[PDB]
C-alpha cells in the first residue's frame, strides 16, 4: 500500500510548507503601508478610440516603442494600430478565426497568435519583399492556446489548455523545454522583466513560478478559489498579481512565498479578465466582466478609479512600456486609449 | 505631411477591405456540432456534403459553416463563449448506445452533456437541432434487449415507435427554458437524405426570428 503511504507523506510535507509560510508572516502589507498617503482619485479620459474590428476582441499587446499595438479579434483579422493617429499599419488575415491571444516581438519584426487550432503562428512584419507573411506554425500542443509571450526573436513561451506550458525555438519549430505540473488548463502567463522566470495561472486556482533555463517549477502559490483568468508581473520582478473568476485580485510575493494583499469589493461579483501594472507599480488596473475597467491602489488595496467606457465585457488590457497610456479592449470590437 | 498623408490613405484602403470581408462573413450561417465522439457526427457531416474542424457546404443559395469541437478534450467552460452567436447548435446522439458503457452507460453521458449545453448561460436563445442517429441499429437491438438497462423507470412495449418516442421525450425534458428556445428533434437513419433540409428549415426560423429583432416586432 505504497500509494496510501505516499499520499500521507505529501500531506505531511505540505503541512511543513504551510507551517513555514505563516512563520515568516511577521506583518501584512496593509499594516506596513498604512502610514502612506493615498494616491487620490484618478480620472482617465478616453484619449483615442480605434475602430475597424467587426467581432469580439480577445487580446492585444503593446509594442516595445509604446506607439504600435497589435489587436486580435474573432473575425479572423490581426490589426496593427498606430496608437498616435489611429492609423492601421497592417491587417493580417488569419487561417483560423478562433484566436485567443496575440503577442508582439520585443524587436518588433514578428507577431504571434494562436487559439482553438492548437497552433501558434509567427508572422514576419519586416517583409523584405512584399507584405506580411507567416513564418512558422508551432504545432505540438494538445489543447487550445491561451497565451504566448516572446522571449526574443527566436524564443517564445506558449501556455495551452493541456495543463502544460512550453518553450519553443522559432528556427526549428521544436519544443526546447516542456513545463508540467499544473492540474488544470493554463489560462495566462507573464514573463519576468529579466526574462529568466515566468508565472502561469491555471484553472486549479494555483500559480506556479517556472524557470526558463532549468525547466523545473520553483515555487507554487495558492489562495484563490476559482480559475485564474489573467496574471502579470510586478515591474520590480519580486511580485505578481493574479485575477481569478471569484472577482478578487491577489498580490503574491516571490520571496515571502505567500499572498500579501487582496483587492476585492462587495459591489463587484464578476470575475477579472485582465490585469496590468503601471510603470511604477503603484496602480493595479484590472478589467472586469461587468463592462468596465478598474484601478486599484496596489499599496493600500483601495479603489481609486473606474474606466467605464465599454458597452461589453473587457477582455484585454495593456500599459505602454513608456507608461503614458492604457489601452483596454472589449467584446464590443472597440479599443480605447486612456490618458 | 507628404509621407503622412500617404499613410492615411493606406489605412483607408485597409478599412474598405475590412468592410468587404465583414459583409461576406455576415452572409454566412455558423453552426456548432457536438456529440459523444462516436455518436455519428462524422456520419452526419457526410450527409450535409488536431484542433478544430471546419466544414463548408451550401444549400439553396445559403452558405453554412460547421465547426466540430470533438477533439478538444479540455474544460468546455473556458472556450464555450467563443461560439456564442451561432445560428443553431447541432447535437448528435446515437440511439444504439443506450446499453453500451464507457460504470455509466454512454447514453447517460450524452444526456449529461446535453443538459449543460442546453442550459448554458451563453446559449439561452440559440435553437438546438437534436439528431438521433443509428436508428437502424436501435430498431434491431430492442428486439433482443430491453430499454430497462438505460432507463429503469421505463414502462412500455419493446417496439421501435414507443421506445424512440420515449428517448426523445427524455432529451427534450432536459430543456429548462421551454419558453425562450426551441429544440428540434429528428430521427436520422444511417443511409438517408433530407437531413440537410431539416437544418435548412430550422436555420430559416432562426433568421426570421433574427430579422424580426431588427424591425422590433420580436
Amino acid at each position: 500500500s505504497e500509494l496510501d503511504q505516499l499520499r500521507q507523506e505529501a500531506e505531511q510535507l505540505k503541512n511543513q510548507i504551510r507551517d513555514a509560510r505563516k512563520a515568516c508572516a511577521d506583518a501584512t502589507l496593509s499594516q506596513i503601508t498604512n502610514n502612506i498617503d493615498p494616491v487620490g482619485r484618478i480620472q482617465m479620459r478616453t484619449r483615442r478610440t480605434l475602430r475597424g474590428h467587426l467581432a469580439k476582441i480577445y487580446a492585444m499587446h503593446w509594442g516595445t516603442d509604446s506607439r504600435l499595438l497589435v489587436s486580435a479579434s474573432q473575425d479572423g483579422k490581426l490589426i496593427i494600430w498606430d496608437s498616435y493617429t489611429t492609423n492601421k499599419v497592417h491587417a493580417i488575415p488569419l487561417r483560423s478565426s478562433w484566436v485567443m491571444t496575440c503577442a508582439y516581438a520585443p524587436s518588433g519584426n514578428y507577431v504571434a497568435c494562436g487559439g482553438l487550432d492548437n497552433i501558434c503562428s509567427i508572422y514576419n512584419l519586416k517583409t523584405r519583399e512584399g507584405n506580411v507573411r507567416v513564418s512558422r506554425e508551432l504545432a505540438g500542443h494538445t489543447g487550445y492556446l491561451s497565451c504566448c509571450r516572446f522571449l526574443d526573436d527566436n524564443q517564445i513561451v506558449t501556455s495551452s489548455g493541456d495543463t502544460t506550458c512550453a518553450l519553443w525555438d522559432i528556427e526549428t519549430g521544436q519544443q526546447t523545454t516542456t513545463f508540467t505540473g499544473h492540474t488544470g488548463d493554463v489560462m495566462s502567463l507573464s514573463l519576468a522583466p529579466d526574462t529568466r522566470l515566468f508565472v502561469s495561472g491555471a484553472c486549479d486556482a494555483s500559480a506556479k513560478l517556472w524557470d526558463v533555463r532549468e525547466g523545473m517549477c520553483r515555487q507554487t502559490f495558492t489562495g484563490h478559489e476559482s480559475d485564474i483568468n489573467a496574471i502579470c508581473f510586478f515591474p520590480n520582478g519580486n511580485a505578481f498579481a493574479t485575477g481569478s473568476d471569484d472577482a478578487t485580485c491577489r498580490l503574491f510575493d516571490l520571496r515571502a512565498d505567500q499572498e500579501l494583499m487582496t483587492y476585492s469589493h462587495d459591489n463587484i461579483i464578476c470575475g477579472i479578465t485582465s490585469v496590468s501594472f503601471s510603470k511604477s507599480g503603484r496602480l493595479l488596473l484590472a478589467g472586469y466582466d461587468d463592462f468596465n475597467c478598474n484601478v486599484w491602489d496596489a499599496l493600500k488595496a483601495d479603489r481609486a478609479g473606474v474606466l467605464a467606457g465599454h458597452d461589453n465585457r473587457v477582455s484585454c488590457l495593456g500599459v505602454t512600456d513608456d507608461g503614458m497610456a492604457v489601452a483596454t479592449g472589449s467584446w464590443d470590437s472597440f479599443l480605447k486609449i486612456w490618458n | 505631411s507628404a509621407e503622412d498623408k500617404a499613410a492615411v490613405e493606406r489605412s483607408k484602403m485597409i478599412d474598405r477591405n475590412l468592410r468587404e470581408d465583414g459583409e461576406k462573413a455576415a452572409r454566412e450561417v455558423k453552426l456548432l456540432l457536438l456529440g459523444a465522439g462516436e455518436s455519428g457526427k462524422s456520419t452526419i457531416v457526410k450527409q450535409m456534403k488536431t484542433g478544430i474542424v471546419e466544414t463548408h457546404f451550401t444549400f439553396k443559395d445559403l452558405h453554412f459553416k460547421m465547426f466540430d469541437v470533438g477533439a478538444q478534450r479540455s474544460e468546455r467552460k473556458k472556450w464555450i463563449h467563443c461560439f456564442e452567436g451561432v445560428a443553431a447548435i447541432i447535437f448528435c446522439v446515437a440511439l444504439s448506445d443506450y446499453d453500451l458503457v464507457l460504470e455509466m452507460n454512454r447514453m447517460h453521458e450524452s444526456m449529461k452533456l446535453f443538459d449543460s449545453i442546453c442550459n448554458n448561460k451563453w446559449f439561452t436563445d440559440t435553437s438546438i437541432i437534436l439528431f438521433l442517429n443509428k436508428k437502424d441499429l436501435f430498431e434491431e437491438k430492442i428486439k433482443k434487449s430491453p430499454l430497462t438497462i438505460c432507463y429503469q423507470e421505463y414502462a412500455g412495449s419493446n417496439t421501435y415507435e414507443e421506445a424512440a418516442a420515449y428517448i426523445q421525450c427524455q432529451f427534450e425534458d432536459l430543456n429548462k427554458r421551454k419558453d425562450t428556445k426551441e429544440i428540434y428533434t429528428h430521427f436520422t437513419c444511417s443511409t438517408d437524405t433530407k437531413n440537410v433540409q431539416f437544418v435548412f428549415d430550422a436555420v430559416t426560423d432562426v433568421i426570421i426570428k433574427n430579422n424580426l429583432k431588427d424591425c422590433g416586432l420580436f
Epitope: R67, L68, D82, N87, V89, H90, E129, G130, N131 | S1, A2, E3, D4, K5, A6, A7, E9, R10, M13
Partner: single-chain antibody, 226 residues
C-alpha cells in the same frame, strides 16, 4: 526586380512601361524618376496605391500621364508631346508609406530614350578626394527646414554606383536602409545635413544624391561625385 521601357523616336510620342516582379506590386506607390545623360536625378510623376492621388512634375504636368495596372503587375507612362529638354534615362522606383516604412528602397534598371514654390537642395560640393580608408563627410543644404512637426526630418540619401541604378542608403534623418553596412551615418539640423562614411571601400565610389520629401514637388541635390 523590374524592367522595361521605350526606344528612340524623332519628336513624337512613346509609352513607358515597367514590369514588376514578385514584391506585391498592388500595395506599393510608384514613381518615375528620370535622369538626363549628364545631370542629376529629377522626379517626374507618382501614382499611389490603389490608383488614388497622382502628382506630376511642373515641367511634365500637361504632356505626361501615369497609370498602373495592378493585374499583371505593370506600370505605364504615356508621353504625348516630347521636346529636346526631356531626353533621359527613366527609372522606376517603388515606395510604400506606413509608420516605419522605407520609401524609395528599390530602384528599377531604367531605360533610355533620345529625341534628337519648390524646395531647392544645393549640395555645393562637387568633387572629393577618392583615397581608400579615409573618413569623408558629404554635406547638403535646403532652402527651408525639413523638420516637420511630427519630429522627423524628411531627407533621403541615394548612392549611384557608376553604371548601375541608384540605391537608397539613408531614409529620413538617420535611419539606415536594410542591407546597408553600418559604416554610413547621417546627421542633420533641419536645414544643413551631412552624411558620414567611416571607411571607404572600393565599392563606395559614385555619385551621392540627397532628396527631400516634405512637399511633394520634391527635388534632388545634383550629386557630389567622389
Amino acid at each position: 526586380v523590374e524592367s522595361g521601357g521605350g526606344l528612340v523616336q524623332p519628336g513624337g510620342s512613346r509609352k513607358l512601361s515597367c514590369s514588376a516582379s514578385g514584391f506585391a506590386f498592388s500595395s506599393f506607390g510608384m514613381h518615375w524618376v528620370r535622369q538626363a545623360p549628364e545631370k542629376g536625378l529629377e522626379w517626374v510623376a507618382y501614382i499611389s496605391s490603389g490608383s488614388g492621388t497622382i502628382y506630376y512634375a511642373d515641367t511634365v504636368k500637361g504632356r505626361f500621364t501615369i497609370s498602373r495596372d495592378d493585374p499583371k503587375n505593370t506600370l505605364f507612362l504615356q508621353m504625348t508631346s516630347l521636346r529636346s529638354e526631356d531626353t533621359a534615362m527613366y527609372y522606376c522606383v517603388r515606395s510604400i508609406y506606413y509608420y516605419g516604412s522605407s520609401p524609395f528602397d528599390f530602384w528599377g534598371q531604367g531605360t533610355t530614350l533620345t529625341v534628337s514654390s519648390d524646395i531647392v537642395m544645393t549640395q555645393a560640393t562637387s568633387s572629393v578626394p577618392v583615397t581608400p580608408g579615409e573618413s569623408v563627410s558629404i554635406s547638403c543644404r535646403s532652402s527651408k527646414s525639413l523638420l516637420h512637426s511630427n519630429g522627423n526630418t524628411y531627407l533621403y540619401w541615394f548612392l549611384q554606383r557608376p553604371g548601375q541604378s541608384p540605391q537608397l542608403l539613408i531614409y529620413r534623418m538617420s535611419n539606415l536602409a536594410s542591407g546597408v553596412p553600418d559604416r554610413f551615418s547621417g546627421s542633420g539640423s533641419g536645414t544643413a545635413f551631412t552624411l558620414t562614411i567611416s571607411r571607404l571601400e572600393a565599392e563606395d565610389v559614385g555619385v551621392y544624391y540627397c532628396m527631400q520629401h516634405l512637399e511633394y514637388p520634391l527635388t534632388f541635390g545634383a550629386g557630389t561625385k567622389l
